[PDB]
Amino acid sequence: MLKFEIKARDGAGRIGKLEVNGKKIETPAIMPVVNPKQMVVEPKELEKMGFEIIITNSYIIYKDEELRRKALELGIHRMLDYNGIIEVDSGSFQLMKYGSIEVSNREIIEFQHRIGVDIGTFLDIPTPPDAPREQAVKELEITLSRAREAEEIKEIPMNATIQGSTYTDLRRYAARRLSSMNFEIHPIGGVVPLLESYRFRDVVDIVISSKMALRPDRPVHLFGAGHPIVFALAVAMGVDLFDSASYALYAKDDRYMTPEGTKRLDELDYFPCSCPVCSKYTPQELREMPKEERTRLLALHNLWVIKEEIKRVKQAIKEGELWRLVDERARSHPKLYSAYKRLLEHYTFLEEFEPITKKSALFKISNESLRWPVVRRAKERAKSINERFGELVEHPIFGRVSRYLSLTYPFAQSEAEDDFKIEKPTKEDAIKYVMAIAEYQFGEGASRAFDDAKVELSKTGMPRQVKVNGKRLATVRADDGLLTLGIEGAKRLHRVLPYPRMRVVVNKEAEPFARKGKDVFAKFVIFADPGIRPYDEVLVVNENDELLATGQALLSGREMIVFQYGRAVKVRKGVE
Amino acid sequence: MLKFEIKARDGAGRIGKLEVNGKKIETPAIMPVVNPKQMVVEPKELEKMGFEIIITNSYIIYKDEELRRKALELGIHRMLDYNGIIEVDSGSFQLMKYGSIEVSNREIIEFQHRIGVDIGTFLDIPTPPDAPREQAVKELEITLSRAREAEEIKEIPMNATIQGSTYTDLRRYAARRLSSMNFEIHPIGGVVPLLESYRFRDVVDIVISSKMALRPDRPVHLFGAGHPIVFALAVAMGVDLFDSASYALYAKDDRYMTPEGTKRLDELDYFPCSCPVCSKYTPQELREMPKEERTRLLALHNLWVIKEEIKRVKQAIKEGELWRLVDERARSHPKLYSAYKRLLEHYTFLEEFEPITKKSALFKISNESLRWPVVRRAKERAKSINERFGELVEHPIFGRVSRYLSLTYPFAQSEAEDDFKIEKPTKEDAIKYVMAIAEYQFGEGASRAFDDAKVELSKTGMPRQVKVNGKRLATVRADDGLLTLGIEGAKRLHRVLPYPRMRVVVNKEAEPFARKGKDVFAKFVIFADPGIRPYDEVLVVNENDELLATGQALLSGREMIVFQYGRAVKVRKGVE
RNA sequence: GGGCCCGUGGUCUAGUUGGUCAUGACGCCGCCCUUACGAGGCGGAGGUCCGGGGUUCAAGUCCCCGCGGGCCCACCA
RNA sequence: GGGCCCGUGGUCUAGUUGACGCCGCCCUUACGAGGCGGAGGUCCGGGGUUCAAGUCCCCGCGGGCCCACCA
Ligand SMILES: [Mg+2]
Ligand SMILES: [Mg+2]
Ligand SMILES: [Mg+2]
Ligand SMILES: [Mg+2]
Ligand SMILES: [Zn+2]
Ligand SMILES: [Zn+2]
């Protein structure tokens, strides 16, 4: 009983709405790991700060006498004075470092119900990296079994943590076994050793391998990752949740955090921040004060950056610049740049979830910029249109491109050293632009659903509304020069394009509304064209392939088929 | 009457100590342009904030009745309640926009003495960009004349503004004419139109052309540049001062500033900041309030980032990562990336001022990282060593390098995707390392000054102190694997290296001290090997080439010969 | 369906003639500046303003109707 | 000439219950980097404290920061 819906999206990640026991939050989001005995910062304020969710170690409490009781006494919220979403850890992380931990998967799994938590974790086994073969195999099974045993003894939302070591094949498997099982969240675990050793590439090989085999709808949390240096990369991998003692742990050893890396106080002459701590202090005066005060103020600051970067990321996603932000943070350190270069290698993975159009332009600002999904796509997607229509124009990013396409995303919406001069149509070809924009936007074929049409030009010279006889097939949206279908056009297309091309099939229950014009909700989608990508102009149909309406996709096809909460299409017009 | 000394340095820029009228400040540093009549934020606060210096438009004053008087009345500081360094503008900028401004170069150059300012600017003429030819020539002469007329009627420190339009040939000339003239500061002007049109390339072409022909000792200020997006770039070009109404001007139009570019309030979902305004508010909430309060808060914010980035930069310089921060900010926007790629093209300009060793390692984080000065040099500088000594090992950044060099900056102090495994010497080789580190560090030759020596190995296996018979020629400094000369060694060298190889020539006056071991001050250097680069291990000598001491250069050779304030060498041992 | 915005390629506005509002937008030719790309600078000429209807001596510009586009809230049936 | 620090490759420590060197297995395209177990050298040089010292204070020989003098 955990709700998850994709609010906005970019890259392969997304900003979502998460609901557990009435308490809502929004992802991406990081959970500050807190060890109750000795709290550097009390939930009291974390909450006051912005953290509407955190995490503690249940197992560490099960051991302590005092808390065990205070626990079963006033729940956990009350015992931490935290009125936000609280989640716990099995203590497997403790089983990784110190090895032997005393408790049964069941004992703790149960112990978590009594303490009245909001989300819990069964005792998964975090095998380390480069671990021997069988040790990964055998250990994963034990994990999978404890995951089954926990599947049916559970009553609260639970984390099904994907283990598998440095073995992408295992990761892949333990991913489908756990995706098909009935759990609410999937954290990718046993990576801290990697992160501490800045093995950002191996981490991505892992996070990718997994996000591929997991169900799109369940939240992915990267276990033990709380440094601003990874968020942008991570999030664009389709990660949504982070947890880490990083902030306090760092602060203790006198380390300062920057989205670009780590700084040793006794190496700071200035404060590369503007938060409340670096505002009223200095590296000199803060190096003066003693531990108790020094680490507290550091942790404090660390939290502020952590928080800040996260907002930074979300903002990037909201604008459609997540990749530029990764390309920027990638420069923060060699090992991470490596990783980024590697992420960009998994085209197929990223392509699937990469929006078809964004709000802000494509920016050529690195060699890597040219390997970004949205580029590769358009280069191939435009290949055919170029030959059929021809009349090419030079492009700073794609080299050559048919003028007919020259005003639609990402061709006209790109910026690079040298500038791209677009070419407005001329009455006589105004159509070929549409035909092109159509075969490009809808697929080898679409052209025909517009064969004979009329293209109006605005006071600028831009191809806008296309209509036949008296009614409009579609409109060349100003922003990105793509086509927004207008019912009549939808129909005209549906006829020219074979099924399942660009279609969404809604259950009988929903069929009524679609016809009217009301939006479609993920839950009611029986199946939809796989090649559907976010913000695609799509055809709503009934199980019998009868046009029901046209709108704007909000999820990849494969995505609507599995989401239960959230909207699938933002219906423009209804067939009735 | 204005002092300027290079505190710390990197790239081609540096953090310096600037003193005018007893009031100290530190560069890089930005001065908020303020228009008295309607002040969005009063100096009162600006100073409270961190701005120990600002600027206003004297010509704007001379026109207004009220102010002209209040001006001649209680000076300027008092009229602005500002107790920091105040500087003014001639109004030429107003001569550019609106064209015709009423006043004589003399009239206002004198009106600036009366109002009792700390720094002033004569009426230079800011020719725009791509302006006709003569219009640039003719106009620059008028500027240079006004600069002569003001050279002799001046009593207060003044800004010698380099004009010249988009003509690098004129820029370079107008730079020598004004470098040789008696002025305190040189702003590079008539660039705003460039900056507003994000022509970051053209700006570099200009800033570079000029920094080349200007005297190293006089501070360079980039007229009208106040956006975080340029600082790292600019500063690494050897700029030291900025001024801009940017913050209030943007805030007015509802634009928010981020090190990476500009954001339109009504496009913000979150606040990618941690300052005092983005902390206690939200994009939603701030969009609600009206102008009076919206603009003020934004301006306020803008100031916070501005300040922030500047610190960022200085920190960068202090650790020796200025370039990494440019490589990062370069990704902020296409046109800027271009510019950066271009700056990196002038190797000879940058190499001269490029530290011989830095505190933090070299980072391979982009294709551009491989064109950074520090690498090109090393690859060439290492060329011969590799042939002579041989026994090469592969390197992630330089491909191949002889082991004997493998522990010396920046080979062992480099980080890139794949890692470099160093090679500690073996007693029998121990020396070849030094010999190598020698010919590499000092020049084709130096090897001999160590021909027969003893290399001690630490508890690590690292070659550290080298001595012959009983005394130490030098030591293999731990952090960078370079040689720190020990007087005996210095003379050993001096003898095998022809003049002026790595020599610093001191005025008779200073010859005394040198011998003792006290540091050398720029002022008393008659001449020094040009191939001298900061943090180079050098030989101090007297006008007749007698070894007087060994130290640590702090300026490129050609730099010592010109600097009056500031120290030239950090003397280690004296010959006496 | 409920609210607000719009008639639109993108990029972007930094040495504040007091703040602010104008001084159209597009397209057409020439000189400059450019390695030509680019991006600017200067001067010429005078066409068009998605459709329909009013208002005014004057209408891209001011309401009004239509055909369109974006954001937000509501419907998870 | 003072005051502080150190005896040193870089990088780096994010689901909070001494060092360098030597051989083998695992994980790695070998690189990288790790994970496991065997082995047990030397720890700038001299003098001490100790049953025991790289480890603790003393002197030597060295590196680093800050502050002072622009003569
Ligand atoms: Mg579904
Ligand atoms: Mg001199
Ligand atoms: Mg909506
Ligand atoms: Mg000093
Ligand atoms: Zn901070
Ligand atoms: Zn802010």
Side-chain angles (χ1 to χ4, degrees):
Chain A
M1 198 42 57
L2 199 208
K3 180 166 307 185
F4 185 32
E5 61 185 83
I6 295 186
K7 182 197 171 199
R9 58 177 324 151
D10 192 354
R14 84 288 288 200
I15 300 163
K17 181 185 174 188
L18 193 63
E19 195 186 70
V20 188
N21 295 84
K23 312 182 192 71
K24 57 254 306 288
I25 56 166
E26 182 186 64
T27 88
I30 195 184
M31 314 179 272
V33 163
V34 292
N35 208 152
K37 310 172 176 169
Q38 167 81 304
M39 295 183 282
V40 183
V41 275
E42 327 289 302
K44 180 179 181 188
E45 79 270 356
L46 298 204
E47 203 150 55
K48 190 69 74 169
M49 279 185 210
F51 295 75
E52 304 301 56
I53 136 176
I54 68 175
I55 158 188
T56 65
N57 193 190
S58 102
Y59 174 80
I60 298 179
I61 312 319
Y62 193 118
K63 171 169 185 176
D64 178 310
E65 263 77 71
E66 213 279 292
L67 289 168
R68 269 289 311 283
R69 202 171 195 185
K70 281 189 63 184
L72 299 125
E73 276 267 341
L74 256 200
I76 22 74
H77 284 62
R78 272 278 50 61
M79 81 130 302
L80 297 176
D81 209 5
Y82 192 68
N83 263 185
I85 308 192
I86 304 154
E87 157 172 300
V88 287
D89 184 30
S90 59
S92 66
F93 183 69
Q94 287 53 57
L95 186 181
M96 179 201 85
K97 157 55 195 290
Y98 309 92
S100 298
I101 258 57
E102 231 49 71
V103 73
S104 154
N105 177 56
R106 188 156 187 160
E107 290 228 298
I108 33 173
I109 284 178
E110 283 166 292
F111 174 44
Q112 288 183 181
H113 190 289
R114 298 176 165 290
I115 317 177
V117 283
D118 284 281
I119 303 172
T121 337
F122 69 66
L123 185 61
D124 66 87
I125 321 314
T127 315
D130 305 299
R133 196 54 160 119
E134 74 266 7
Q135 194 221 161
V137 209
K138 284 186 297 179
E139 225 164 309
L140 172 52
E141 216 297 302
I142 304 174
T143 335
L144 301 170
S145 298
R146 304 191 185 187
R148 226 173 299 85
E149 196 195 83
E151 157 171 43
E152 42 172 284
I153 164 66
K154 59 173 307 302
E155 271 302 352
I156 47 77
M158 174 161 263
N159 280 156
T161 305
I162 302 71
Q163 217 56 66
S165 189
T166 192
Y167 297 76
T168 21
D169 55 54
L170 294 180
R171 293 277 169 176
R172 200 147 290 128
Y173 180 63
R176 35 199 202 70
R177 276 281 62 60
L178 284 279
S179 49
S180 72
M181 280 179 82
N182 182 41
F183 305 75
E184 340 302 271
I185 293 178
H186 286 71
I188 301 275
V191 294
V192 259
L194 286 196
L195 299 174
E196 293 165 305
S197 179
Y198 272 32
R199 302 171 89 163
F200 298 101
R201 195 165 49 203
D202 261 307
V203 175
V204 175
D205 282 323
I206 292 184
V207 183
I208 263 304
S209 175
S210 296
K211 228 282 204 155
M212 277 177 316
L214 301 212
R215 313 209 296 149
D217 64 341
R218 283 113 90 89
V220 183
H221 162 17
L222 179 41
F223 254 153
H227 192 333
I229 218 182
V230 262
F231 305 178
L233 189 173
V235 166
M237 284 244 257
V239 156
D240 312 285
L241 300 180
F242 303 106
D243 80 287
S244 71
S246 71
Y247 73 121
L249 274 181
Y250 271 12
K252 191 146 197 181
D253 202 303
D254 298 315
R255 291 180 313 209
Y256 189 78
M257 298 192 308
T258 14
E260 293 87 359
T262 10
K263 299 319 180 183
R264 292 293 313 174
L265 187 40
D266 48 293
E267 222 285 298
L268 269 288
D269 282 295
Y270 307 73
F271 259 153
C273 151
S274 275
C275 70
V277 182
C278 308
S279 260
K280 105 174 206 315
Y281 247 80
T282 69
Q284 231 303 80
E285 53 165 336
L286 193 130
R287 52 183 59 276
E288 237 75 77
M289 261 327 99
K291 309 308 300 62
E292 198 72 46
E293 194 63 325
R294 191 216 309 285
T295 64
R296 198 260 284 194
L297 278 176
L298 280 225
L300 264 196
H301 136 78
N302 289 180
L303 286 166
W304 283 96
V305 175
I306 285 197
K307 182 199 171 69
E308 196 194 37
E309 173 73 336
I310 230 64
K311 305 199 287 176
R312 177 160 287 125
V313 150
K314 289 189 186 159
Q315 238 298 326
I317 304 192
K318 202 67 206 173
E319 315 189 304
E321 297 260 9
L322 179 48
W323 287 119
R324 200 207 57 78
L325 206 80
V326 197
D327 194 77
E328 182 183 12
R329 297 287 180 256
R331 271 70 231 209
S332 294
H333 174 127
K335 285 304 197 79
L336 181 150
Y337 166 60
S338 170
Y340 163 72
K341 293 204 290 199
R342 156 61 116 295
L343 160 65
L344 299 166
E345 275 185 71
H346 298 284
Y347 181 40
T348 52
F349 173 74
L350 293 315
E351 199 316 273
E352 185 217 297
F353 318 65
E354 177 91 289
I356 222 60
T357 156
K358 301 178 192 173
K359 17 291 169 174
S360 58
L362 165 107
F363 277 172
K364 206 277 263 275
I365 47 53
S366 104
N367 269 81
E368 289 67 42
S369 169
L370 307 180
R371 268 173 288 168
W372 281 353
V374 45
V375 173
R376 291 281 207 58
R377 204 150 87 189
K379 227 146 184 182
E380 276 155 345
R381 189 157 301 200
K383 255 178 270 177
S384 77
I385 292 65
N386 283 304
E387 281 107 357
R388 216 300 253 313
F389 308 74
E391 287 219 62
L392 314 200
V393 166
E394 42 164 332
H395 190 266
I397 308 161
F398 314 101
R400 14 51 181 278
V401 124
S402 151
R403 65 181 293 233
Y404 295 112
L405 273 178
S406 91
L407 19 46
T408 108
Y409 179 89
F411 301 101
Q413 287 79 30
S414 76
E415 183 74 338
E417 312 80 344
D418 315 73
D419 294 65
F420 182 70
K421 185 170 293 182
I422 68 178
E423 310 236 309
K424 291 172 179 179
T426 67
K427 35 290 159 181
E428 318 105 45
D429 42 38
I431 184 78
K432 301 178 65 185
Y433 273 65
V434 184
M435 309 241 291
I437 307 184
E439 181 141 297
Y440 169 82
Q441 180 183 355
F442 296 126
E444 200 260 306
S447 332
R448 271 157 58 196
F450 303 93
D451 252 1
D452 20 48
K454 231 298 175 65
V455 202
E456 318 182 316
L457 300 180
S458 53
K459 78 186 88 172
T460 54
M462 292 288 277
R464 296 305 160 190
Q465 288 187 288
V466 263
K467 45 179 59 175
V468 63
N469 296 160
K471 281 328 297 89
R472 68 169 270 262
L473 290 183
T475 291
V476 186
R477 182 201 306 169
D479 299 358
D480 66 304
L482 286 201
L483 290 166
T484 67
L485 297 165
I487 193 53
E488 169 60 277
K491 171 66 185 152
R492 186 146 317 183
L493 218 152
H494 177 59
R495 174 190 81 208
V496 198
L497 268 208
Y499 174 100
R501 288 182 50 178
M502 309 323 130
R503 290 188 247 268
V504 285
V505 303
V506 313
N507 124 265
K508 300 187 293 185
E509 184 168 358
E511 175 160 18
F513 309 98
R515 292 183 179 262
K516 276 122 71 177
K518 274 127 180 178
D519 299 303
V520 180
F521 301 70
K523 233 216 297 176
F524 316 147
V525 172
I526 311 178
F527 164 86
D529 185 14
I532 297 177
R533 268 54 163 171
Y535 319 82
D536 244 312
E537 263 327 272
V538 81
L539 306 183
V540 171
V541 303
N542 85 289
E543 219 172 351
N544 267 306
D545 206 348
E546 290 177 55
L547 191 75
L548 307 174
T550 197
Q552 174 142 262
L554 295 193
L555 301 75
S556 152
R558 294 191 18 176
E559 278 188 347
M560 281 152 297
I561 265 155
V562 320
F563 268 59
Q564 248 61 215
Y565 311 87
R567 256 183 310 188
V569 177
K570 281 165 65 173
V571 183
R572 289 170 197 297
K573 280 304 88 180
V575 54
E576 311 179 310
Chain B
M1 343 77 207
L2 186 161
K3 198 168 300 177
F4 193 65
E5 173 186 7
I6 266 39
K7 292 315 304 174
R9 62 161 30 181
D10 192 4
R14 60 330 177 70
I15 12 185
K17 275 190 176 184
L18 191 131
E19 303 171 53
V20 186
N21 276 45
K23 302 169 179 175
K24 315 175 193 70
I25 176 182
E26 188 182 57
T27 57
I30 141 70
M31 48 188 94
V33 157
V34 296
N35 162 53
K37 311 187 66 174
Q38 207 253 168
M39 301 206 312
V40 50
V41 178
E42 294 184 297
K44 205 173 182 182
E45 300 99 305
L46 284 80
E47 184 168 5
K48 192 153 292 180
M49 297 208 237
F51 302 155
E52 308 109 340
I53 162 174
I54 68 169
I55 161 166
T56 204
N57 193 104
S58 80
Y59 164 71
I60 292 274
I61 274 165
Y62 189 103
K63 219 188 174 189
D64 192 25
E65 176 169 60
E66 275 279 299
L67 311 158
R68 189 197 260 203
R69 318 171 91 170
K70 187 180 174 186
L72 300 188
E73 189 172 65
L74 46 169
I76 186 62
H77 304 64
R78 327 216 54 163
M79 167 199 203
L80 278 48
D81 215 355
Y82 193 54
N83 42 307
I85 304 171
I86 280 197
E87 85 165 64
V88 256
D89 194 66
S90 57
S92 46
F93 186 91
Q94 277 63 47
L95 157 68
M96 191 207 283
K97 302 194 56 159
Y98 319 143
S100 303
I101 83 175
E102 286 69 54
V103 75
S104 89
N105 178 167
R106 180 153 194 168
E107 290 184 55
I108 163 164
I109 205 304
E110 70 184 15
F111 178 101
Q112 277 167 46
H113 109 276
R114 301 189 195 182
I115 64 88
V117 70
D118 292 69
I119 295 196
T121 277
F122 54 103
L123 190 52
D124 49 53
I125 221 165
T127 48
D130 312 293
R133 186 54 175 266
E134 268 80 65
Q135 167 169 159
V137 196
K138 217 299 146 55
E139 217 148 270
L140 167 57
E141 243 41 50
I142 289 183
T143 286
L144 292 163
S145 152
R146 293 188 175 183
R148 320 182 211 290
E149 183 212 66
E151 175 192 34
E152 68 204 3
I153 186 198
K154 74 185 297 297
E155 333 209 297
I156 165 82
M158 198 130 297
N159 286 306
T161 281
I162 298 169
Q163 284 301 347
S165 200
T166 353
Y167 303 90
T168 189
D169 95 83
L170 309 211
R171 292 279 170 159
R172 242 174 301 79
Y173 149 74
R176 308 186 186 79
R177 162 84 63 264
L178 295 173
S179 225
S180 46
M181 282 214 174
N182 179 267
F183 293 82
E184 11 271 291
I185 252 176
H186 300 293
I188 310 184
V191 201
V192 185
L194 254 51
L195 310 126
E196 286 157 11
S197 312
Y198 285 43
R199 298 162 69 170
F200 301 107
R201 196 200 326 88
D202 286 356
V203 152
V204 174
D205 258 27
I206 290 183
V207 168
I208 288 287
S209 95
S210 302
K211 250 230 94 196
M212 280 192 109
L214 298 199
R215 266 52 138 71
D217 72 318
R218 274 94 146 176
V220 187
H221 151 120
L222 188 59
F223 254 132
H227 191 292
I229 196 143
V230 238
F231 299 170
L233 190 65
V235 148
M237 217 156 303
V239 181
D240 296 306
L241 269 65
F242 309 75
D243 82 85
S244 280
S246 19
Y247 77 70
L249 274 174
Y250 273 27
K252 296 296 300 183
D253 184 65
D254 259 58
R255 297 194 296 278
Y256 172 109
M257 288 181 193
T258 75
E260 291 91 355
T262 300
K263 302 321 170 67
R264 246 160 33 58
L265 187 56
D266 53 298
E267 184 195 293
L268 283 172
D269 264 55
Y270 312 80
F271 266 143
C273 185
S274 305
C275 76
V277 171
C278 297
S279 212
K280 65 191 171 188
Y281 284 66
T282 48
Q284 62 157 309
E285 295 169 357
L286 223 170
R287 198 182 304 83
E288 319 274 9
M289 358 179 73
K291 236 70 179 180
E292 160 214 6
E293 196 177 7
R294 205 192 314 164
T295 310
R296 201 278 229 237
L297 275 160
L298 281 179
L300 223 25
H301 159 70
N302 288 3
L303 300 149
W304 282 101
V305 227
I306 290 199
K307 256 191 59 175
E308 180 178 359
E309 182 79 338
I310 305 271
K311 305 186 183 171
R312 296 192 119 295
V313 190
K314 302 183 189 174
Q315 176 59 42
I317 303 184
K318 198 64 122 300
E319 34 187 296
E321 88 179 11
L322 225 297
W323 283 132
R324 193 215 108 294
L325 162 60
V326 212
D327 202 278
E328 168 161 302
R329 285 287 172 304
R331 319 298 179 186
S332 305
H333 180 300
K335 302 293 204 63
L336 203 80
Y337 178 56
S338 173
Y340 168 65
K341 281 199 290 139
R342 184 143 205 160
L343 175 83
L344 256 326
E345 301 194 303
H346 316 240
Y347 170 77
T348 53
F349 171 84
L350 308 195
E351 200 275 354
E352 169 161 77
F353 310 25
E354 189 86 310
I356 278 232
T357 152
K358 294 172 198 174
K359 306 201 184 182
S360 36
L362 164 62
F363 275 159
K364 199 302 193 48
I365 31 61
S366 70
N367 262 57
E368 288 60 59
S369 97
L370 280 96
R371 302 215 300 281
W372 289 338
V374 257
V375 251
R376 301 259 288 285
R377 177 193 288 155
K379 220 162 189 172
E380 167 173 50
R381 283 218 186 185
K383 239 144 65 192
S384 308
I385 316 294
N386 293 77
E387 183 71 30
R388 228 184 189 173
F389 301 61
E391 277 71 304
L392 307 163
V393 50
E394 283 142 25
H395 190 337
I397 298 60
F398 317 73
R400 57 280 146 162
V401 71
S402 57
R403 61 188 281 174
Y404 310 68
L405 231 344
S406 113
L407 334 170
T408 333
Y409 182 112
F411 305 56
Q413 294 70 292
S414 59
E415 242 266 328
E417 317 83 0
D418 185 45
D419 259 324
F420 181 41
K421 220 68 160 187
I422 37 177
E423 296 265 289
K424 306 268 192 47
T426 75
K427 187 165 175 292
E428 316 79 66
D429 305 45
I431 188 57
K432 297 164 97 79
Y433 278 49
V434 209
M435 309 217 86
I437 320 297
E439 290 256 323
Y440 165 139
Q441 183 169 325
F442 295 105
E444 199 293 330
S447 147
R448 299 156 186 186
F450 301 63
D451 287 319
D452 37 9
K454 312 168 164 52
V455 191
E456 59 183 48
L457 296 176
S458 184
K459 75 158 101 310
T460 326
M462 294 285 273
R464 297 308 181 190
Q465 276 166 286
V466 283
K467 36 199 171 204
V468 291
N469 282 162
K471 26 181 180 174
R472 50 253 70 210
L473 295 333
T475 319
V476 177
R477 186 201 308 204
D479 79 60
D480 73 9
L482 246 17
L483 297 312
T484 15
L485 285 191
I487 211 68
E488 155 69 15
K491 205 59 179 183
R492 288 279 275 175
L493 222 64
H494 184 321
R495 154 214 146 205
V496 59
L497 250 67
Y499 175 90
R501 301 256 258 120
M502 51 191 51
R503 249 86 141 180
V504 192
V505 161
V506 286
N507 167 305
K508 54 164 289 303
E509 292 200 8
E511 183 179 329
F513 313 56
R515 285 174 166 294
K516 285 225 170 178
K518 307 292 197 302
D519 299 329
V520 187
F521 287 37
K523 172 105 63 193
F524 315 108
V525 216
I526 243 57
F527 170 97
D529 172 42
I532 246 189
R533 303 269 165 285
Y535 309 88
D536 238 325
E537 215 53 70
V538 312
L539 310 201
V540 202
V541 157
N542 76 317
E543 178 199 75
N544 282 65
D545 195 38
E546 291 177 298
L547 176 41
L548 307 210
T550 293
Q552 200 79 327
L554 259 64
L555 296 179
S556 157
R558 100 170 187 66
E559 285 191 293
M560 296 167 179
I561 285 72
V562 196
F563 264 134
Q564 299 301 236
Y565 315 153
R567 53 174 191 178
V569 190
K570 240 184 57 187
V571 205
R572 179 182 307 315
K573 294 193 184 174
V575 298
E576 173 225 80

